[PDB]
């Protein structure tokens, strides 16, 4: 699709057998999603850094469908004000900024 | 333009007679820049909201050049970890997400 930015670029995703919504966020290096139960291995990761750090679970090579595109990438799972698709997954879907 | 997202989408901007760099951030509603002295009227605005609020100066209808595109939009001026071009100015330059 071509997505204009008059509104927040919120898209449907399929992750861990669930349907969710997340924000395509070119300002975020990583993808962070809450309320998902992923199977397989994880390790803790510290993110943020303003006011302290937030600890999340890092799952590598997670299959995820983003607006119809089936890809693989790292997903950080933990409480986040809004579900965020970061650059790490936007590259996978071939998403560019164009003007 | 076409900007891929393997790296952070940092572009050159011209604002208030200064050359600066800023991050094209589709996760940000607004544009926030530090270390700029803009002429003309402003009003305080509270932004963020995690841990408290941050107070910035809101300047409306500011001419700014973003990666060669001369546009007009609101610019919030104050402390920011990273200079951010928000959706409000990406719409002005005709920037879309494409995949």
């Amino acid at each position: 699709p071509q997505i204009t930015l008059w509104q927040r670029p919120i898209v449907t995703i399929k992750i861990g057998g669930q349907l969710k919504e997340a924000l395509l966020n070119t300002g975020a290096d990583d993808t962070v999603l809450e309320e998902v139960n992923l199977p397989g291995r994880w390790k803790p990761k510290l993110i943020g850094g303003i006011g302290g750090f937030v600890k999340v679970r890092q799952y590598d090579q997670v299959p995820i469908e983003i607006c119809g595109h089936k890809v693989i990438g790292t997903v950080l799972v933990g409480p986040t004000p809004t579900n965020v698709i970061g650059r790490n997954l936007m590259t996978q879907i071939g998403c560019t900024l164009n003007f | 333009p076409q900007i891929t997202l393997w790296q952070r989408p940092i572009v050159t901007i011209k604002i208030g007679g200064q050359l600066k760099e800023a991050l094209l951030n589709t996760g940000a509603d607004d544009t926030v820049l530090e270390e700029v002295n803009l002429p003309g009227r402003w009003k305080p605005k509270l932004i963020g909201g995690i841990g408290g609020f941050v107070k910035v100066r809101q300047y409306d209808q500011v001419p700014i050049e973003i990666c060669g595109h001369k546009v007009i939009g609101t610019v919030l001026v104050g402390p920011t970890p990273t200079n951010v071009i928000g959706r409000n100015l990406m719409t002005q330059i005709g920037c879309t997400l494409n995949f």
Partner: peptide, 7 residues
Amino acid sequence: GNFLQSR
């Protein structure tokens, strides 16, 4: 590293 801004 994650620079959202919902206001």
